Amino acid sequence: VNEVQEVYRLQGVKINDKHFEVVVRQMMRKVQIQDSGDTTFLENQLVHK
Amino acid sequence: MARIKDNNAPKRFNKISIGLASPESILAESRGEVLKPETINYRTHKPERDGLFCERIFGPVKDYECACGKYKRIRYRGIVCDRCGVEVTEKKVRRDRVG
Amino acid sequence: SVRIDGVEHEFSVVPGVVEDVTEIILNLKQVRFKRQIDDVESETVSISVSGKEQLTAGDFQKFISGYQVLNPDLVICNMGPKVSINMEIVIEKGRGYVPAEENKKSNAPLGSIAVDSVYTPVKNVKYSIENYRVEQKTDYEKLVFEIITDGSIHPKDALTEAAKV
Amino acid sequence: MFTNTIERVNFASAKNIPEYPDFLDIQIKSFQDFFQLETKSDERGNEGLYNTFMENFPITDTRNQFVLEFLDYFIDPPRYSIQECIERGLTYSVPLKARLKLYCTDPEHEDFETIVQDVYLGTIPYMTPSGTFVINGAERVVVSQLHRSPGVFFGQSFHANGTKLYSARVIPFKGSWIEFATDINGVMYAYIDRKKKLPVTTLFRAIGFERDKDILEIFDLAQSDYAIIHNTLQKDPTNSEKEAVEHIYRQLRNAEPPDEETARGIIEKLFFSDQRYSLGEVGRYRMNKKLGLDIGMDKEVLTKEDIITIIKYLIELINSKAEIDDIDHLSNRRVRTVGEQLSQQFGVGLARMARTIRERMNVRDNEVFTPIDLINAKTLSSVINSFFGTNQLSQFMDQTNPLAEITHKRRLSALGPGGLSRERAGFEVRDVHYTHYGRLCPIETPEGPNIGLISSLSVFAKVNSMGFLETPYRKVVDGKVDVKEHIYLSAEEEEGMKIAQANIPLKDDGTIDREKVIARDEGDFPVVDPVEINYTDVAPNQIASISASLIPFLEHDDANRALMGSNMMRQAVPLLRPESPIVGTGLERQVATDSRVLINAEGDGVVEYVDAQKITIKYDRTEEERLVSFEEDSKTYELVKFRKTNQGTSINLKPIVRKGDKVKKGQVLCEGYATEKGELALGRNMKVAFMPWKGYNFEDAIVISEKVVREDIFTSVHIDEYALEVRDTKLGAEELTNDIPNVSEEATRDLDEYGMIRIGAEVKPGDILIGKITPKGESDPTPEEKLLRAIFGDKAGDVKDASLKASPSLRGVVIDKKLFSRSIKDKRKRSEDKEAISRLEMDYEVKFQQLKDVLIEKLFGLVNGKTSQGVINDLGEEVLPKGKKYTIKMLNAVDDFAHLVGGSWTTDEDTNALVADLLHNYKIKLNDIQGNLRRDKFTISVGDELPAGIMKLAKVYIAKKRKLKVGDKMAGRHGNKGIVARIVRQEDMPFLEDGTPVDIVLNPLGVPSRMNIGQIYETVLGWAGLKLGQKYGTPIFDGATLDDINELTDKAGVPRFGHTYLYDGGTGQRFDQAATVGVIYMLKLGHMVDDKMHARSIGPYSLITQQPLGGKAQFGGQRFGEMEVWALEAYGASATLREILTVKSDDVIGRAKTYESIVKGETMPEPGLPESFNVLMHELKGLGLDIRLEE
Amino acid sequence: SLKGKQGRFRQNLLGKRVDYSARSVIVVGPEMKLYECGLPKDMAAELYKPFIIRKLIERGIVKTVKSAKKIIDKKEPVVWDILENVLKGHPVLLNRAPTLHRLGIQAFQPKLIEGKAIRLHPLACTAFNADFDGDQMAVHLPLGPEAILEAQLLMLASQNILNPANGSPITVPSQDMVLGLYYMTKEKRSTPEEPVIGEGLTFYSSEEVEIAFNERKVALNAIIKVRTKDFNEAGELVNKIIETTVGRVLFNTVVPEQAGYINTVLNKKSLRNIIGDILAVTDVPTTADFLDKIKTMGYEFAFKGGLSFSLGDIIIPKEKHEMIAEANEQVDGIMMNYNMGLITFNERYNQVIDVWTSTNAMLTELAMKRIREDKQGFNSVYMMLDSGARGSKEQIRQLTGMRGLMAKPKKSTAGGGEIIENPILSNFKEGLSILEYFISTHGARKGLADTALKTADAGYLTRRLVDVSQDVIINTEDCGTLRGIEVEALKKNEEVVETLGERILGRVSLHDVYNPLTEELILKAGQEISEADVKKVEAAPIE
């Protein structure tokens, strides 16, 4: 968030941090599985949290 | 002309379901079977019977007119011609009938 | 309105005439009229000119009865000595500017070409304000008026009509 | 002194400016070099179509028994005129006839007589005198292509790992490309057509360097510098010539060679065969110059020494001992003129024709045949017509105004076949280069995706024989400028030379009068002494194009605004009454003269008759010219009156000369079409005040006076051509008639018997222009139709209405109608036509006899009493006996005067030359009469020429007089574009102390951010000129200064800088601050509001998507795409988005129900399923997925 | 038929062409209100055709839709009489492509006008990015009552004062308006040559100031004293005598009362801050009325002043030649230093560039000072630049000083464009030589190409962001999390770029926050941080 907002700020444009926060939230909706256990999932699979 | 009230009410739905298609389902939805690979007659520009554009399967090309011209005008709506087997209806049906 | 014999639209040419019908129309727009007979609001003028090397606005005067051409030296077109020009013009009364679109009459004869009409008689109005001394007070104002007209209305009459409005 | 020539006060200070090279030379000179029509048969040089025929001839069969040789080519007069071709929608083309000699070299075929016959090779489109081509009735320009020059370039590239890769690319004039490139491992490879790589040691073995010893002896193997060669040897899988050649065969054809000979022959044909590989003169010259080799220019194939030298140069390039080649350098970019492209197309067509002929004579070995039976003219005609019709360089002509035309003809395009693409066009190529100085205009380039890719030639630049650009310089020795002669220097000749500006101060002897002068040295601009100069510029406007040279005070305008102004004047609509600018540059007269749109006097003479339709001039001729020419001394010129252009503008020419006026060669005879009195007049001079006006000039808006509309200052005429083709269908032949079923008599009242609207009738939207009935298949009429027929009695036949109707935005007056109809050849009609051709043949034969005896009279007058030296026919027959005195009887004994090419007539060389010229003009006149006979024969036989399947072609022309109105786009010459926001009454407009109102108001806020003070200067100088009754010429960089304008305004009684106190028209109160007032030159652009307003409630819908159509002509709605849907989603406008996506676009039932509900005032029906979703569902069901809608 | 850019999903489902739509060229309707747009008669007649048909059948003039269509096509006066009533309460939607933000589509109340161009309010131009140099806009007509209410209550231009990106006002006056407001609100002091009428007078209220101004007994820029309402140190509304300007009093006559008294020279930045504060203390309709009034006032006072662009306002310093000469002698000193081997080639190049750029900076400062002190700051060019209406310091420098150093177009793959050691000495008033013009063409073409080529990349980035963020919708009022983000003032190089209150403004507090010095409850958990809370936090030592 800080890096993107800094890049946008260098050009004199003001955008609230909440928009970048909303986007970055969607950018972090998944996890990578390290051990399937007995579950349905598979090794190194990307699944929703 | 005032558009006819198509009594096929808009199907209200909030859910979309997908799956494998059974042969029985395809036969149920199909209006007929396609035998001939011909599309249309190159001379009369009319669709060949039992072809990929046949009027007995998919519907009449002209509104309220059968393939052989025996039945014309809206007064024969819903009647399937005994000579050509084409239902007397709107041309719009050629977008929904499946073979 | 203007109707030149043998001309069906404003984008044509009269044989033997240097200027096209468009330039003739633009020159005809510049002709100025002063009323000579009272109560004359509209007049139809049939003009037939031949044997001349130049059609001037003064050549219309021999055919106009109720109006007077104020600029007879205005050249309408240059023609050959063997060119015969037969044209019909309609003179009407109006205010300000009326585009040729509004002047088109549905009952007009074939070949009639409507023209833009600039009805305004006043070319320029200039006024100045100078101080004036009355007895002991020097703050009173003096108004000076300079009016340039086309000759159809006298400047005094123009002032009187503006005051009347 | 001429009465109608505009005199301008020129502020130019530069002296000895030579004449501008003809602006249409790049087209006309190239085409004339290609065809060589004006050159006699025996004087035809080895260039153009003659070389095209030589390179493809003689054609010999596989057995070398039949030889087909080319002798000469002759061109007939065109079948139709330029105006006729435009009106009829045909191509202005000339027939080509070739004299061919066929003989058999086989002694077993001694009975085969030698045949010499003139073969008609088909119609070739011919260039107009204005430098254009008329293709399918519309003018086109073959824009010159700026492509990479033939030769070898040493370029450097970076691999993904950052390692520098050096490459040498050889592109031939005709043949395959070869590239020597290095890899990341230090092993360099040779790429053939970029398909598969081969180590160059393998190529060396294949080209004769079998052993490693020879290859190392090539480079005399400093070892670290040449380690690449050792690495390539180490990676070479071959050791002998046979192995290398077999490996090359396997790499190229992906198969094993049947034998060594074919494998060697593949390499020989690829790289050393004239038929398949051709470097050309340009490529050979460039490679010889850059490689330091002295190979003869006659060798056009690659050689071993060339390959060795290229590899050596690449090796030193890797060693940083050589520089890389700049691709954008104009030495590396070569101009392909129209003549060159025509030469290539003719070469390809003749190659195909030669292959077809070879196959035919391989088939017809034992039959007696003539060259006519061997040639199909369609092979060449189709190739040339395809090039003129489908190639990207044959573009639609920009005919908005003469400036646009002359800029289009001088345009250079980097696109097209053999050029660059928009996707592959980087920042570098689009940039301006130092070699563009005086060759490519750095100001004029289109905005958008084509910036830098489309360039305009400079005023003084020309294209040489080799195809490179030269611009004129003046030579300097010891600081002394040679002011008498100038030398054209190319980009390669300009390297290492220091160049100063044209306006540098010189003494009377030509010595530079400066201690230090700025100089151009390549890409830098160093300061040098006058001794260090090599060359000097010639004109102040040498860098600018024709457009950029028409902007006054351009040196005061920002480069971007200069670009916009240059682009914008080319969009200026021709006005009804054009007026030359008060403040101009002086190039307007030259632009009008060189445009060749205006009728130019061919020589000195006196005008006999002046009319709006024609001009007659009696040209002054000397006695020998009268003795030699067949034409009358009087020439009649037909003026172009209301001719539609490509962009819909109108060409209207009005004569400016009067009866009895004296003219000389090159004089302009007519004004009009954005010209006034021989000067280019794109717009009008207008009084302007710079102040904000109640916010109506906000954000580039323009406030204008009503006097502009009143006096037709910016009124322009546009013409629209509508064509309806009648066709023969299966159900019957379509017909044009006024009896259109289900149409009231009022709508057809203006139609003639042929269904065409009457000339001069007013066209309103929806009016019927051309009435057409299409035959209808037998269908029983509906009960409503039957009732209508019974009531009104209309005998509606079995036809359907297909009449072309006026568009909803069309309002105008018909000014021309044209109907071309194909003659129906009936037996009686064929007999009548045959009798007509017979009678025409007798009359024409009488004409040829008349022409022959006037020949006899003139020839006898020239050669009376002299002796004949023997004149030989083309067959070698000696027609006029040598030693006999010339008599009338023996001259009457010569059967054919068109074919004497040999022998001598008299001892007097002057008499012989006069007789030769007389014979040449006789040949021209006889060819003209024969072409006339052929044209009338065609007219009687077939009639009007129409495309196949079309029986009649109907055209209607409508002229639209469009006044200036709110929304119309106006612009100056300095980039100040704008939209008319309000037409203000003259009483409300600002007025001066004298009561005179200003005509236009511009926002002062637009100037400081855009840095175009040139408009300010033009305003002040134009006010000075209008008050003084003077017009001025302002050359760029050598124009009017501030002190001169101040002096002129002081003389004219104008406040300095135009700073005067204005008065409000509404309240009469003087404004608090003085305003800049004066006269500015304004143009009216083609972005007019009448063509851009569109509105639709309902209309036609598309076929598959059922969406409403797009475009104004189809009466369609606007596109409502993804970003705007995102905007609706952001607003939370659910219902608006739903309504738009379904009931306004593709809900077939929903849209009709919504319209009915709106009309009847009921509640809006619920949206249904869009047809796009129905199509998606149907596709997914057809693909075998069961999809159900669940509630 | 399904995948790819040309498949059904991306081609026929995400975009469509619509009925009840229109398009034409846009012209400025400065006499209109913020929520009004001028609509040409033909466009309105075609768009509102079925409504006009309905009213025709209701009036009994025509019994069939065909006769109604015939009447409408003939453009009879009754059609206009009906259309005038039909336009009322039925807004249209104005869209200019590209629609980069939601303000690219706005709802306006249509008005019938003459001509064929759509009239746009000047304040919507910034949101639409629309100028009047040939731009066109699409017109979309909502049909159903839900759509009409949606437009009126969410997409109306008067309701869209704020920028959704940051909350700052986007309907700020510009160009003519800003210049006029600046001209009216600027002060002029009396001089013996140009005495100012009415300076030093005292007035009981704005009423007497208006009386004096209308009587021409006081100047617009005169420094006066007036008695009116203004906030005291406690935040209450009291009367006091405040030194002000007649133009400022006239400007405050339309300012909403609750905003106090505005006593500063008006520029674009101050105007934006003022509109923000007024909307903070009042409601949206009052701010819209204020915007309309100040727009009219700025336009009128810019028109009355006759503010122009003349060659006399571009005052090239008389010392320009002298400092160019001094720079030339310094460059000569550097060159002879290099020739004797005292400095390197790179050092000489850097020193020459430094000398030229110092000369350019000094000349820019001197030119700005001259133009500023000209006519007591009432020079039209200086008024245009200082107010923020148009123009920058660099552009005024190029018109008056020297265009300066230029970058070479060289194709150096390693380094960037080198700077030519000889700058463009001439300016646009003096005129550029052939060489200088050829040099500047490089930069002009480079800029045009860069813009034209990178617009599409920006659009692609926008598309990817929309694709990744489309599913975020506020669905629940509170999820009850105890987790939050710790926000502090943004400092860069010892400079506070964003204040703590500005960053936390509009957020919801995690826990209760107490003043460390007074133990007062500043913030409550689960409550929005308003502007007053922002001031309280800034007063307290909270970081």
Ligand SMILES: [Mg+2]
């Ligand atoms: Mg724009």
